[PDB]
Amino acid sequence: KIHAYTEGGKPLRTIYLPKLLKKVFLDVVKPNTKKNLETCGILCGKLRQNAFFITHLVIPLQEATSDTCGTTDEASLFEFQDKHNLLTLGWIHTHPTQTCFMSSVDLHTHCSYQLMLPEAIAIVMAPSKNTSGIFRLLDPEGLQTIVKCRKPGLWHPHEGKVYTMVAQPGHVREINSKLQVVDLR
C-alpha cells in the first residue's frame, strides 16, 4: 500500500507500533519526569511477514540526568530479549521540560540502533509540551556524519542535515496491537 525508502533508496520495512505505547511509557516513568530526569525505554518485537511488530516496551536499569539517560546493565536487558527472542526495533525517551527534537547525544545514541537495523526509530516524548516525534538519521548521509564525528563534549553541533521525521504510516504505523511493559529497574 504505502512503502517508505531511505535517502539512498533502500526500502524500509513497516514497523507496527501499539497506539498505547507512548502513553504507558509516560506513565511508567512519570516519577522520573517529575524530578525533571530523563528516562529511556527499548522498543522490542518480532519480524513477521516482512514487517516488524513492537510487542514489548522494556525499561532497562539505567542512569539519568536532566538531558541524558543510558542503560547501565545491558546484561539483564540482553538476557530478557534473548529469552523472548526479541529484536531491538528502536528506543523511546523523555525530554521532561524541552521541546521534542534529537539532541547531539540522541543522534550518537541512535546511530548504534540504525546501524544494526535500517528501520530503527527514536521516539521522543516532550510531556511538558504535550508533543512527541518519531525520528531517524538520514541514510546514508546522517549515519555517515555521526560516525565521522569526533567532536568533544556532550552538546556539540553537527554540520548539515543529519536527521528527519519517520514516514507515518509508511515506515511507522500506530495500530491496535498487544503490548507488554517490562520494568527491569
Long-range contacts of 173-177 (CB under 8 A, 24+ apart): 173/14, 173/15, 173/16, 173/17, 174/16, 174/17, 174/18, 174/19, 175/16, 175/17, 175/18, 175/19, 176/18, 176/19, 177/16, 177/17, 177/18, 177/19, 177/53, 177/54, 177/55
Q: How far is the CB of 14 from Zn ion (least distance, A)?
A: 25
Q: Please identify which residue in 26, 28, 149, 179 interacts with Zn ion, judged by CB under 5 A.
A: 149
Is 106 a binding residue for Zn ion by CB under 5 A? The answer is yes
d(CA 66, CA 38) in angstroms, rounded, equals 6
Q: 98 is written with which cell numbers?
A: 524541552
Closer residue to Zn ion in complex, CB, 1/150: 150
The verdict on whether residue 158 carries a ligand-binding annotation is yes
Binders of Zn ion: how many residues, by CB under 5 A?
Answer: 3
The verdict on whether residue 110 carries a ligand-binding annotation is no
Q: How far is the CB of 157 from Zn ion (least distance, A)?
A: 8
Q: By beta-carbon distance, which residue lies closest to Zn ion?
A: 149
Is 126 a binding residue for Zn ion by CB under 5 A? The answer is no
Residues that bind Zn ion (CB under 5 A): 103, 106, 149
Annotated binding site: 93, 95, 106, 108, 149, 156, 158
